[PDB]
């Protein structure tokens, strides 16, 4: 519907970039993912930054059972991150974990960028990634991660610290969720 | 996006009806509208049950300035509710006031039902009201309320207490917001 909340969240996100506080966030860990999430949803979602205690789904696809989150989250964390493919593989798992009640996609995309920034010196130019193509690649990722790999690989940038490049990407990241 | 939060809110709405707690929500008042909202969004929205202190919009349409909410809310609450037309006019004002950050549509639709129940012993068969027709009528409502008045008048029921009917109704209400 109107998604008024998300308008406010987008502003928190922008604030996160503009203030330089994003450099302060721990990278590649679930703590770091929680930090991102808290920043984006604090004051909006009661569970901002909190691991869910309920099960969630898209269609007939259940995300990781909250029963196992304590086990699988550290296991994802421990995955290697030495190249592009490994990092995308780690991202695909973290998305399957989908550890929050809402806002997994936009928090985890930032998380991914930080991981690519740290290890590869790259980020994803989300605004060059069409929404339908992104969603369909994500939907296929649990079974075949080739689509999402190819799609992210086509659109890396070395322009890793430029505030407006980053803000354009976050704007698109929120557009993926329906905010136009 | 996935709207996991909304699925969780749907279960809370169902529970509100099924448990019979709905029978002691105060009818036709701001406090009552807040009770509804609190109940649907508690533990989901940080702001569950609270009047917003920010401005919100759809397109270039701003809902009532949060600067005036303290003044217009009591004025809306004072509006007559003796017949169908009055109750709908009251509802239309209440939607324009849009006093919460998010979840105005679902809370206020329930609020409408309770008013119609108290006053005319009817409820709206939401599941028989197409979503495009509903959205178009609401969009036109600030300027001309005939569309919404006509649409609602055609899908009223005397069966105000059947919880199957009520659940079908609330499921459709959530569907209006994009929950599928
Ligand atoms: Zn709204
Ligand atoms: Zn999701």
Could you say which residues from 43 to 102 on chain A have a Cβ atom under 8 Å away from some Cβ of chain B?
43-48, 54, 56-58, 101-102
> For the purposes of burial, counting CB atoms within 10 Å of the CB of A150, is it exposed (0-12), middle (13-18) or buried (19 or more)?
exposed
State both tokens at B171.
Answer: 């499921």
Distance CA A47, CA A38 (A): 8
- Tokens 């590869």, residue? A120
With contact defined as beta carbons under 8 Å apart, do B92 and B142 qualify? yes
- How was this one solved? X-ray
Classify each residue of A81-110 as buried b or exposed e, where b means 16 or more C-beta atoms within 10 Å of its C-beta: beebeebbbbbbbbbebbbbbbbbbbbbbb
State both tokens at A14.
Answer: 């922008």
With contact defined as beta carbons under 8 Å apart, do A31 and A77 qualify? no
Are A43 and B44 inside 8 Å of each other by CB? no
Beta strands B123-124 and B156-157 are antiparallel
Are B102 and A7 inside 8 Å of each other by CB? no
**CA atoms lying within 13 Å on the CB side of residue B146:** 1
Q: Considering only CA atoms, which of B171, B120, B175, B103 is closest in space to residue A45?
A: B103
Nearest CA distance, B108 vs chain A (angstrom): 14
CATH number assigned to the domain comprising residue B142: 1.10.3290.10
Please give the backbone phi and psi of residue A28, each rounded to the nearest 5 degrees, phi first: 90, 10
- Domain span at residue A110? 1-180
For every residue of A45-110, DSSP letters joined together read BTTTTPPPSS--EETTEEPSPTTTHHHHHHHHHTS--SSHHHHHHHHHHHHHH--SSS-HHHHHHH
Distance CA B90, CA B159 (A): 23
Q: Considering only CA atoms, which of B69, B169, B64 is closest in space to residue B109?
A: B169
State both tokens at A61.
Answer: 């696809």
Q: Considering only CA atoms, which of A16, A37, A171 is closest in space to residue A97?
A: A37
Largest CA distance in chain A: 41
Nearest CA distance, B54 vs chain A (angstrom): 9
Distance CA A72, CA A94 (A): 9
Contacts (Cβ under 8 Å, ≥6 apart) of A36: A16, A25, A107, A110, A111
What's the start-to-end Cα distance of chain B, in Å?
Answer: 11
With contact defined as beta carbons under 8 Å apart, do A135 and A68 qualify? no
Contacts (Cβ under 8 Å, ≥6 apart) of A148: A88, A92, A137, A138, A140, A141
How far is the centre of ligand 1, averaged over its atoms, from the C-alpha of B66 (Å)?
A: 14
Number of structural domains chain B divides into: 1
Could you tell me which residues are beta bridge partners of residue A123? A157
């Amino acid at each position: 519907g109107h998604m008024h909340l998300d308008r406010q969240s987008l502003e928190k996100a922008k604030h996160l970039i503009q203030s330089g506080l994003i450099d302060t966030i721990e990278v590649g860990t679930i703590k770091g993912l929680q930090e991102i999430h808290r920043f984006l949803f604090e004051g909006l979602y009661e569970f901002a930054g909190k691991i869910r205690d309920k099960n969630i789904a898209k269609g007939n696809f259940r995300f990781a059972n909250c029963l196992y989150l304590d086990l699988i989250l550290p296991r994802i964390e421990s995955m290697p991150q030495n190249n592009f493919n490994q990092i995308v593989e780690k991202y695909v798992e973290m998305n399957i974990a989908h550890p929050f009640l809402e806002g997994n996609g936009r928090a985890t995309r930032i998380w991914l960028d930080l991981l690519l920034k740290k290890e590869l010196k790259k980020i994803v130019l989300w605004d060059r990634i069409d929404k339908a193509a992104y969603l369909s690649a994500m939907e296929r990722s649990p079974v075949n991660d080739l689509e999402i790999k190819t799609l992210l690989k086509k659109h890396l940038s070395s322009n890793t610290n430029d505030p407006l490049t980053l803000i354009k990407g976050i704007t698109q990241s929120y557009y993926y969720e329906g905010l136009g």
